[PDB]
Assembly symmetry: C2
Homo-oligomer: 78 residues x 2
Amino acid sequence: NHIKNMTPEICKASRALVNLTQKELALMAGIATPTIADFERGARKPHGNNLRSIIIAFENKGLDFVEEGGEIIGIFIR
Amino acid sequence: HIKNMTPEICKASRALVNLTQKELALMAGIATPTIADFERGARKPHGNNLRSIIIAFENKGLDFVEEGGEIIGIFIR
């Protein structure tokens, strides 16, 4: 897709909008829980399939991200 | 035009701008227990409290999109 990055702030905000724990996001996205924890503290940046899976998990929970130049600039709640 | 903010939008908005509850409360001119109780879903902010919370977020660079009096979106500046 067209999103190239997701900041810790956007990850954390997106979980709060749809009442997701880290463990449930990890399970939906098929990623280890501590890796999710690393993305949220900025210890690693999500890229590739990890980034695509986290985006899809949030969209499946009814979020829609607004992208500009590869960066998320907005979140709509559907 | 915003008539309600959900606890989820308040928590999400603090995450977007790295504010603690105490910090949001200081910006909104409200006591921290009021913010904490709002985020627990125990009370719904109304009136001047709701307005002060929205303004504190806008001052931190969020823009809200409103429909039917509800927030349906948040933009980061």
